[PDB]
Design an enzyme around this catalytic site. Structure first.
Site, PDB file in Angstrom:
ATOM      1  N   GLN A  80      14.184   0.082  -2.327  1.00 25.47           N
ATOM      2  CA  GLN A  80      13.431   0.652  -3.451  1.00 25.47           C
ATOM      3  C   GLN A  80      14.394   1.389  -4.428  1.00 25.47           C
ATOM      4  O   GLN A  80      14.219   1.325  -5.661  1.00 25.47           O
ATOM      5  CB  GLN A  80      12.304   1.576  -2.930  1.00 25.47           C
ATOM      6  CG  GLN A  80      11.395   2.125  -4.018  1.00 25.47           C
ATOM      7  CD  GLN A  80      10.500   0.996  -4.608  1.00 25.47           C
ATOM      8  OE1 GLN A  80      10.282  -0.054  -3.984  1.00 25.47           O
ATOM      9  NE2 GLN A  80       9.963   1.239  -5.786  1.00 25.47           N
ATOM     10  N   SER A 106       6.821   4.908  -3.285  1.00 29.65           N
ATOM     11  CA  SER A 106       6.383   3.518  -3.374  1.00 29.65           C
ATOM     12  C   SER A 106       5.531   3.110  -2.184  1.00 29.65           C
ATOM     13  O   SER A 106       5.971   3.252  -1.002  1.00 29.65           O
ATOM     14  CB  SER A 106       7.604   2.614  -3.340  1.00 29.65           C
ATOM     15  OG  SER A 106       7.187   1.245  -3.447  1.00 29.65           O
ATOM     16  N   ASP A 115       3.212  -7.633  -3.342  1.00 31.22           N
ATOM     17  CA  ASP A 115       3.237  -8.197  -4.703  1.00 31.22           C
ATOM     18  C   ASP A 115       3.062  -9.708  -4.591  1.00 31.22           C
ATOM     19  O   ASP A 115       3.819 -10.354  -3.861  1.00 31.22           O
ATOM     20  CB  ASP A 115       4.593  -7.889  -5.369  1.00 31.22           C
ATOM     21  CG  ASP A 115       4.688  -6.416  -5.798  1.00 31.22           C
ATOM     22  OD1 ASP A 115       3.604  -5.758  -5.825  1.00 31.22           O
ATOM     23  OD2 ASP A 115       5.810  -5.913  -6.034  1.00 31.22           O
ATOM     24  N   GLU A 165      -0.891  -3.430 -13.243  1.00 30.59           N
ATOM     25  CA  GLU A 165      -0.178  -4.539 -12.557  1.00 30.59           C
ATOM     26  C   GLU A 165      -1.164  -5.530 -11.936  1.00 30.59           C
ATOM     27  O   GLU A 165      -1.768  -5.274 -10.876  1.00 30.59           O
ATOM     28  CB  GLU A 165       0.819  -4.000 -11.492  1.00 30.59           C
ATOM     29  CG  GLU A 165       1.852  -2.998 -12.079  1.00 30.59           C
ATOM     30  CD  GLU A 165       2.855  -2.448 -11.065  1.00 30.59           C
ATOM     31  OE1 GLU A 165       2.715  -2.700  -9.834  1.00 30.59           O
ATOM     32  OE2 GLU A 165       3.839  -1.790 -11.513  1.00 30.59           O
ATOM     33  N   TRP A 167      -0.522  -7.892 -10.161  1.00 31.34           N
ATOM     34  CA  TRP A 167      -0.022  -8.645  -9.000  1.00 31.34           C
ATOM     35  C   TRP A 167       0.099  -7.820  -7.715  1.00 31.34           C
ATOM     36  O   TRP A 167       0.415  -8.369  -6.654  1.00 31.34           O
ATOM     37  CB  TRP A 167       1.359  -9.212  -9.361  1.00 31.34           C
ATOM     38  CG  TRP A 167       2.297  -8.056  -9.744  1.00 31.34           C
ATOM     39  CD1 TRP A 167       2.945  -7.180  -8.874  1.00 31.34           C
ATOM     40  CD2 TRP A 167       2.616  -7.597 -11.078  1.00 31.34           C
ATOM     41  NE1 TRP A 167       3.661  -6.246  -9.598  1.00 31.34           N
ATOM     42  CE2 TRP A 167       3.477  -6.478 -10.947  1.00 31.34           C
ATOM     43  CE3 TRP A 167       2.265  -8.034 -12.367  1.00 31.34           C
ATOM     44  CZ2 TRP A 167       3.998  -5.797 -12.058  1.00 31.34           C
ATOM     45  CZ3 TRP A 167       2.788  -7.352 -13.478  1.00 31.34           C
ATOM     46  CH2 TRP A 167       3.645  -6.245 -13.313  1.00 31.34           C
ATOM     47  N   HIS A 168      -0.138  -6.512  -7.809  1.00 22.70           N
ATOM     48  CA  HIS A 168       0.127  -5.576  -6.708  1.00 22.70           C
ATOM     49  C   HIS A 168      -1.151  -5.183  -5.998  1.00 22.70           C
ATOM     50  O   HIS A 168      -2.056  -4.569  -6.583  1.00 22.70           O
ATOM     51  CB  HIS A 168       0.869  -4.331  -7.252  1.00 22.70           C
ATOM     52  CG  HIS A 168       1.164  -3.273  -6.223  1.00 22.70           C
ATOM     53  ND1 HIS A 168       2.445  -2.841  -5.967  1.00 22.70           N
ATOM     54  CD2 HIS A 168       0.347  -2.515  -5.453  1.00 22.70           C
ATOM     55  CE1 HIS A 168       2.421  -1.890  -5.056  1.00 22.70           C
ATOM     56  NE2 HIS A 168       1.157  -1.662  -4.727  1.00 22.70           N
TER      57      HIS A 168
HETATM   58 ZN   LIG Z   1       4.430  -3.760  -6.102  1.00 23.37          ZN
END
Ligand SMILES: [Zn+2]
Ligand SMILES: [Cl-]
Length: 251
Positions: A80, A106, A115, A165, A167-168
């Site tokens: 990360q 995160s 993701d 987002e 995609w997350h």
């Molecule tokens: Zn992510």
């Protein structure tokens, strides 16, 4: 039947499926166990075992075949950190603060976040393509039936601190994911919401047998927190990463 006491140490508020991890509330327990590869076809993408199993159930249910690929799952602290500093260099500071979580803030470091992207050779790691049409949208609409939620919506940016987002996705477990969907809640909102339901005032979730599920919040004591549970029930307990516990009882 018989009731059973569970004794919890304060530090267990930093473990479990319902941790709120964000700019305000860092990960405090790096010790994720039960990581396994999400899929034979992607050995380098790990996630918590029950979460990989659930992700397979969703792909089967929507017949995803090979059209959706996991792009990032579990990330260690060093991964990360490298992603954040490399994004500082490639993308600049404004973009990175909006799209890349700080190290130790995160959800990827929990093994509960993934993701996802359309299966192409042209995949952007930081922004994979996961549109609101076709198979990706079939996943998105099925996800809350299985314990997953899309973590960062456009209408919640001021609350999550992270930009939209597509995609997350974050695993919180059923029925929590379904309650969040019915209410349009981000995780930040659900973590506050469930505090309104204590043990003498539980939240009741029921569909149509199936089964009745009760959920309630327990504030953590300074030392040991004591929770009572029926021996006559499957239950789960999770910390919220802040101040207490959410208990889920399957009746
Ligand atoms: Zn992510
Ligand atoms: Cl008891």
């Amino acid at each position: 039947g018989m009731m059973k006491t569970i004794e919890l140490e304060k530090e267990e508020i930093y473990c479990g499926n319902l941790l709120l991890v964000n700019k305000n509330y860092p990960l405090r327990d790096n010790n994720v166990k039960g990581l396994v590869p999400a899929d034979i076809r992607f050995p380098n993408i790990l996630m918590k075992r029950d979460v990989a199993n659930v992700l397979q159930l969703i792909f089967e249910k929507i017949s995803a075949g090979n059209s959706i690929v996991p792009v990032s799952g579990y990330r260690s602290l060093e991964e990360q950190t490298a992603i954040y500093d490399g994004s500082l260099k490639d993308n600049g500071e404004d973009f990175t603060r909006k799209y890349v979580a700080l190290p130790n803030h995160s959800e990827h470091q929990t093994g509960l976040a993934i993701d996802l992207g359309l299966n192409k050779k042209d995949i952007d790691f930081i922004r994979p393509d996961f549109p609101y049409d076709g198979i990706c949208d079939e996943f998105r609409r099925a996800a809350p039936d299985y314990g997953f939620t899309q973590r960062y919506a456009r209408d919640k940016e001021e609350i999550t601190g992270i930009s939209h987002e597509p995609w997350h996705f974050r695993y919180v477990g059923y029925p929590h994911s379904k309650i969040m969907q019915e209410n349009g809640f981000s995780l930040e909102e659900y973590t506050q919401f469930i505090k309104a339901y204590l043990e003498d005032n539980k939240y009741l979730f029921e569909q149509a047998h199936r089964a009745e599920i009760e959920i309630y919040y327990v504030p953590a004591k300074d030392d040991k927190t004591l929770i009572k549970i029926p021996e006559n029930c499957v239950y789960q307990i999770s910390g919220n990463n802040i101040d207490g516990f959410v208990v889920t009882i399957w009746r």
